[PDB]
Structure formats: C-alpha cells, structure tokens
Symmetry: C4
Subunit: 49 residues, 4 copies
C-alpha cells in the first residue's frame, strides 16, 4: 500500500504547490502595482507642487 | 484505490476552498488600499 | 480502513485550517497597518501644507 | 497505521514549508511598501 501512499502525497503535493505558486503570483502582482501607483502619485503631488 | 481517491478529493476541496478565500482577501485589501491611496492623492492635490 | 482515511483527512484539515487562519490574520494585520500609515502621512502632508 | 502517519507527516512538511514561504513573502512586500511610503512622505514634505 506504500505505492498508494506515494500517490496520495504526490497528488496533493501537486495541488498544494499549484495553489502556492498562484498565491505568490497574486501577492507579487498586487504589490508591484501598489508600488507603481504610489510612485506615480508621488510624481503628481511633486509635479503640481 | 477508491479510498485513496476520496482522501485526495476531500483534501483537494479543503485546499481549494482556503485558496479561494485567501485570494479573495488579498484582492479585497489590495483593492481597498488602491482606493484609499487614490482618494488621499486627490485631497493633497485638492488642497494645493 | 475508512476510519484511517477519516483520521488522515481530519489531521491534515486541522493543519490546513490553522495555516489558513494564520495567513488571513497576517494579511489583515499588514493591511490595517498600511492603511493606518497612509492615513497618518496624509494628515501630515495636509497638516504642513 | 504507520503509513497513515507518514502520509500526514509528509504533507504537513509540505504545507508548513509553503506557509512559511507565503508568510515571508507577505512580510517582505508589506515591509517594502511601508518603506516606500515613508520615503515619499519625506520627499513631499521636503519639497514644501
Ligand atoms: C491554508 C494554509 C495554507 C498553507 C500553505 C499553502 C500553500 C499553497 C496553497 C495553499 C492553499 C490554501 C491554504 C490554506 C494553504 C496553502
Ligand atoms: C500585494 C497584495 C497585498 C494584499 C494584501 C496586503 C495586506 C497587507 C499588506 C500587504 C503588503 C503588500 C501586498 C502586496 C499586499 C498586502
């Protein structure tokens, strides 16, 4: 039944890994954009005075 | 190996549910931070 | 072996649930603080002109 | 039920590892956003 155990762990590892990479990507996505937005607005505040 | 299938399935449902929840939360707070920032930028530019 | 299956799922559900609540708490923690920081700084920019 | 123990253990290690990684990332980006904000606040206040 060890091969079954191996398959159980492997299949859920793939699942866990996939959702992990997706959450990493999303966190990175929103953070990059928040930085962009902030740096853009700072340029306007300083641009207009 | 039907038992194996059910174990994987039951935990996949759990993993997927918590994943969708964390996604939703991240989107919620990021969207709000964007709104807040754009709001305050208007106030600063609106006050000179 | 169904009781074993049940125990496997339960034990990993507890684990998954715990790490979930922790990540939620952390996301909430940092977001609340970013909002606080932003709103504080806006008060200074507007306070000093 | 040693096989059961190893299944739980092996997946607990995986779950814990990805959890610590996501924590670290969240802390990394939040810390950086705080630094960026405090930096720009100084520039705006330093320019009038
Ligand atoms: C709760 C805790 C988690 C820890 C680590 C994870 C890694 C990848 C995807 C995940 C999805 C959902 C989780 C829920 C979670 C994940
Ligand atoms: C990208 C997305 C985020 C969503 C929610 C957050 C909550 C608190 C601090 C955060 C910092 C950085 C993020 C980047 C981010 C945060």
């Amino acid at each position: 039944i060890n091969e079954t155990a191996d398959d159980i762990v492997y299949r859920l590892t793939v699942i866990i890994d996939d959702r992990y990479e997706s959450l990493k990507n999303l966190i990175t996505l929103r953070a990059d954009r928040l930085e962009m937005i902030i740096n853009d607005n700072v340029s306007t505040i300083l641009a207009s005075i």
